[PDB]
Symmetry: D2
Subunit: 440 residues, 4 copies
Amino acid sequence: SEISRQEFQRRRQALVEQMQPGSAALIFAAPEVTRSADSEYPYRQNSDFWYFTGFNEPEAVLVLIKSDDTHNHSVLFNRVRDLTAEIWFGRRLGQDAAPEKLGVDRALAFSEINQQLYQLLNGLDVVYHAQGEYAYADVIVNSALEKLRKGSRQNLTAPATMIDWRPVVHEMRLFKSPEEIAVLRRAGEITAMAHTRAMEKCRPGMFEYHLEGEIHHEFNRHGARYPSYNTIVGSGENGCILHYTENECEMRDGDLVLIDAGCEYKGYAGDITRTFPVNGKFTQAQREIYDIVLESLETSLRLYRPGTSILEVTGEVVRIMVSGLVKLGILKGDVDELIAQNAHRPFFMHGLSHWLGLDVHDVGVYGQDRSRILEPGMVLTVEPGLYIAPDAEVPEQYRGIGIRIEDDIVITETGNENLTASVVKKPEEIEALMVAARKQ
Amino acid sequence: SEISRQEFQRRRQALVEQMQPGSAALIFAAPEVTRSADSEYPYRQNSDFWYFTGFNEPEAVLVLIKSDDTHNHSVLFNRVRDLTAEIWFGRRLGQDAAPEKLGVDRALAFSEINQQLYQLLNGLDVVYHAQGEYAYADVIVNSALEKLRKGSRQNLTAPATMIDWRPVVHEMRLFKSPEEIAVLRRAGEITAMAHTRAMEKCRPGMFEYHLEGEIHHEFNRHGARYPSYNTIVGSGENGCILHYTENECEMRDGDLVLIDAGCEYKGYAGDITRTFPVNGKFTQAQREIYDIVLESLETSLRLYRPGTSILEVTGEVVRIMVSGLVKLGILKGDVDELIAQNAHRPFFMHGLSHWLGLDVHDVGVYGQDRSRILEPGMVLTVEPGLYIAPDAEVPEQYRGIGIRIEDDIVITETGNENLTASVVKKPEEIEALMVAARKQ
Amino acid sequence: SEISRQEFQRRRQALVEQMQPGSAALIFAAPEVTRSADSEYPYRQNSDFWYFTGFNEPEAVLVLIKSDDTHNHSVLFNRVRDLTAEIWFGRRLGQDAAPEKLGVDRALAFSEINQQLYQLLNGLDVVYHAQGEYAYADVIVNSALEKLRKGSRQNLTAPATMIDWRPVVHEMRLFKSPEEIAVLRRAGEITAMAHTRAMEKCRPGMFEYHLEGEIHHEFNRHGARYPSYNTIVGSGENGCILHYTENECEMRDGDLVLIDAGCEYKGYAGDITRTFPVNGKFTQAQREIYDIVLESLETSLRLYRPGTSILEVTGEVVRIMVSGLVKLGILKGDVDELIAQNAHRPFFMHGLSHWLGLDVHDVGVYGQDRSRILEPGMVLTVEPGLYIAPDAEVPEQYRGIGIRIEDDIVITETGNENLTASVVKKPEEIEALMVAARKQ
Amino acid sequence: SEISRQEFQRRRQALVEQMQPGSAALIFAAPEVTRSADSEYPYRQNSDFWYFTGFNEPEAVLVLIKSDDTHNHSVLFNRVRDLTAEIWFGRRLGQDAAPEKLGVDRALAFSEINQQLYQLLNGLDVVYHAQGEYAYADVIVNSALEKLRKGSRQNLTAPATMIDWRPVVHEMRLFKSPEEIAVLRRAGEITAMAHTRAMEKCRPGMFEYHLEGEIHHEFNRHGARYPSYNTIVGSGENGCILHYTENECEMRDGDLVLIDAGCEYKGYAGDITRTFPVNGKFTQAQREIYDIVLESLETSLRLYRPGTSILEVTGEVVRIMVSGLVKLGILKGDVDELIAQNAHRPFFMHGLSHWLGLDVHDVGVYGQDRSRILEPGMVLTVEPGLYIAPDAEVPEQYRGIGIRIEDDIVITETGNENLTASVVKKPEEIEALMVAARKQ
Ligand SMILES: [Mg+2]
Ligand SMILES: [Mg+2]
Ligand SMILES: [Mg+2]
Ligand SMILES: [Mg+2]
Ligand code: NA
Ligand code: NA
Ligand code: NA
Ligand code: NA
């Protein structure tokens, strides 16, 4: 699956539709990023710039100009072609090929942006600019606006109104199109295949990072070169650290291992967590905690649909958690009172769900306490967990247990579609999978 | 292999030895680096900070204070311990454990650096600071020095002399200790095993990125989680691009594939290039170019020793290249004249060798034209290549061929030790390896 | 004359009237300005901040909040009272006295602005801010907006729309109220008295700076402590330099002296130029040039009225200049052709008129080529001049002559009122004045 | 009096003498400084730049290059000549005239400094630069050093050592040459004449600013166009504010007026304070305080000589003050105890003396508590004062009295020379002066 030329075009038009007449929107590419000395990390495009272009180069600026309600055009600034720079560092689109390739009206050299941008903004009433996003972008934009402000004797005028386009654009990104859902569906499959493989490869005596290696290799073979975020393999007490990425410990028989990993496929994030026994057999104590987390997920998967909210489903999860923890003697007292005192928080201290898309923690307004009513096309995670500290004052057998189980869903007209259900989460199915792998 | 506590101690003392009395050296940690929105790339410590500490956290500053020729002490600024921040983002050393763990005399909270640093610099004559390295570091250092400058009524004085420690420290890093060589030896082995595997897995119809996946998985399984640089898998004409990292093409029967990849093991870089037939059998045209590159490497491996230079060995390589290219009719004319006109440059347009260590392109002075006399303990790459453009005006059969073969060596008392010779480079050994793998 | 409490109130309301509902306007005070080391220049308030407050302290911010069409309030940030700082550097308004003194609803300490400003902007749709005016202001405003942007979990939202209030405020400043005109009338009188005095004191052998001393003393005695701009006393060839402020030469019998000087009275600028013989008697050559400049001024004073423009009156001045210069043989050819070729420009190379108010070169839109139609309440200068270079290829007697004559006017319903006519400009009246003084 | 070409030359050589071989010193001109909108304050050169050049233009950099102990040369960067810019804003030295005019070896255009400075610093070991003095200078210097650092392949090297020249240069400025003393002598005379005049002009009903006008006019007529600092005319309770510059009040019969004013003559500061009765007759209460301040000054003038310190003379002044205040019943108790408790501080809360030169509060190290031993050629102020707050709990007749009396001295071989004694300070001489003037 991919995003079509036509889709990038529609998105640009959908933004232009909302813009004032006599305005320009300025969207800047991510800078290149140093890893050490003269070596750079693999390039990751700005998600908003990518969203309108699918163009994976730095030193690029998309300028969308709305003259009026029926007239608009696009200008791209991008790197010029250069034989020496390309022999060295790889091929460039250039100005000649860009109009056709990226569907823009005009393409200019990024080296000329300070000589050209103010000319494009001259006489407009409004400029849409994400101020503070990048310092290089702010320098360029402020420099242009000052030229116009100070150039009245050359008959230049600056737009007096600057508007942040991020609220508008992030609101668009919150609702996935069919194409986006198809891409995210494949990301979920790829990510699920990686998690299945990690379960099948796990043996006591392997290191946490070995499962990371298996996962990344599986991403890569389906064409998702990079993870959407740094992979978490927390065995034992390391599972109680929410973003444990050291992955440095020997995995021990008797311990659980929590894997939080997701591929990046055509820009879009998969995001799965599975927790499982290193030796392929849950203990009673482990099952007791796992079942509470599993019921929370399964109940949330049933409940999520248009018209509810993350807040509303979270309250149901809290009830399940508090009840299960009371039955185990991890909490003590009246369930409704304990719920009212938020007594689950030492054990479940993060949110149940976040938006998912071009960023793993995706853009879009949640509303107060994540109370926003859900609608079709929203994509989100469902990730209950219970984390019992090594030194929690609870029965010994529960101490140092971290369990999270996480699926990715899209809200549909009648409910949701689970994008990550092709990797098992029921404990008996996990155990069967691992037994089968150990035979073979 | 690893670097001992004692070794980090020796390095600190070796720096203090060269410092003026009444001085402090300030070495700052790398910043955390955004990949997209709120997600960050895996953390990579500043190589110089790492060199003196082996400490892999951000927001840390090593301060080495030389009172006089027999009196010095160390102060570390690092992140305070914090239950909430660590439950979330992972464990911290803190101030209590740091003196013993990192062998420093005193550890303070990084949050207090603006309140404490000027007190440490007060009354000193000299401050060693790598000005321009990081903007956050410059802000901190300038802020301290201004407090001292302006505080004469509180009996404060700033050191009037600021010295860049990078020349001194990079000169130290240029000469590897036995421990460093042992670590780099293992990096070379790990990297060689990865390249062997890529040759064994290669089949027509696989994508360039698939070999990248194999290579990274192999790094990871020996405990080198990350590459030292972005991996290059250039098949066909992509092999003529020196830092081709797109790795996006289907590998085609008949083409060569050039793999440039290196692991990062305990901070230290492996760096190997192997070029080989996608189908496991070099053609005549491919052999003809390959043999020139192979002779260049093999001759360089013989020649490298104390008392020669990269410049001197490069001249021998140019002769081999020009002669081989004339025999193939790719160059025309008198060899000595063609050599004098640098007629190899359209085909070999980079250096033969760079320093190798904590950075793949390592620190250390090369001298004019890389004429510096080599001495024992220097570590470098040996990487001749020939790149014939798709549209070079040469016989058709050589067009679009890129071949590089690269080994890593340490200069010894009598010559060099090859750290990467455990992966094959003789064409008949390559072919045998691939045939054996294809059976299975 | 002064500006009333009520007037500052009206101006604030006139701005609020034009603001969107759900918005705040932020107006910042000028920084203190170093003259050398720890000494500072006399403090000059930002003209726009002054316009809304009449408050002459640094570290102050006026915040005007429009909740809706009938609800708005003002918050001032200003320096706290401080016994030690005031014993040293002088009295402060403080927070307690400010509401009553400056007619604001609330006053807070400037030291708390980073803790308070974002709270004031929270939930608004629009912020009016003069971006780029002051770097300290931009830091404060950007810092507030980032807190709001990043604080959605604390239920904070930033206004997405930022509007430059300068166009609106400068448009207001372009039209003087009766009070402003009364203040500018007194500035014109004070400035005229200074110019009269300089004519009366001038003797050959005095230095240019001596007339500067006389002028400044006269400003000061009427309560205008500072000039509105650096005083120009250009005798001889120095009169051909438009902003000659060195004022370092001995004034010589036979030379003209050009004086451009203006007081600052209650924030408002006077701005007069008079040119006259150092010895009190114009030569024939001097009269010949002077009369052309004088006719240009006198004609412009007749012409200026509602419905004409600076551009239109300038064309009349060009005609007068070109005709007079042709009659003297300084220009050669057909008048209409010479006019069409802009042949006056080597001799008259600046504009005839600029806006006058809180700044000598006052704010307000001029239109293309200063074609904006004039209306009652606009205040402007009328300043024709002729400057014949020492080495101009013209008859010898005109070389090195600089003459400018400048008056300040307000456009009325039927024409204009001349604010500076109490200092003489007719040559015979100048000569009489100087003769009378020499007796003284 | 003036500073000779030869003197500027000697100073440059005296600096070069102290510089390391293989080094360059970089001294930057002051920026132009905005007063309001497009109007600028009168230009004031950086005191250190002036000290080596006597050059009064912005956008200039003096570069002194020491190749070795017998070889050095100077390069000036300054503004190019420009007919249009000079017709407008005044004459420029340019590159052609600068070598001869300012005694430098070479002059280049300031517009080329980024293309030229790194070439001048290339291969040097040390750069002397006043880091933090000006942001524009730091940008230029850091930019040059980065070009050199990153240009090893073009055989460029940066000096690794940066040294602040301010300690060295300020140490030079602390000791005035005969020429400097002659210039400061004339500044003292000019300033004294201004103070005499203010006493002679003072009448009840005049405003504080009127005496400011008289003072500035007198500065100007002797060729000192500008004050060295903002003039203080504190009548009545305003005399209790140390840097009262509002000068806005009507001077009232019965009150004292404190005048602190100083001219700037050839760059050098005069600095005098005189306090006197507005009506020309001290009251008993006023005499009682005045005599203590006068005895303090007169005693200090006797004591100041080589081998004492400001600290040592200050202790004598404290004794005089505490004794006088006890006798008046303003202090109560044992003198030695009151001295030990610093009981004078509510009434005398500033230092007795500061260095005087190109800055009124001049550069140069004071030592702890201003204990540095005085030597011939040091120039300083002597300024005891007593300030009794309007609400001090002391006998009614002393409340709201501020008296300071200040003279300027140079330390000689046997004592000091008083540069400001030509204006009277004995009360009977003040009264006689004012009576004589009133007749006017
Ligand atoms: Mg356990
Ligand atoms: Mg071919
Ligand atoms: Mg003449
Ligand atoms: Mg009294
Ligand atoms: Na998640
Ligand atoms: Na290499
Ligand atoms: Na004017
Ligand atoms: Na003083």
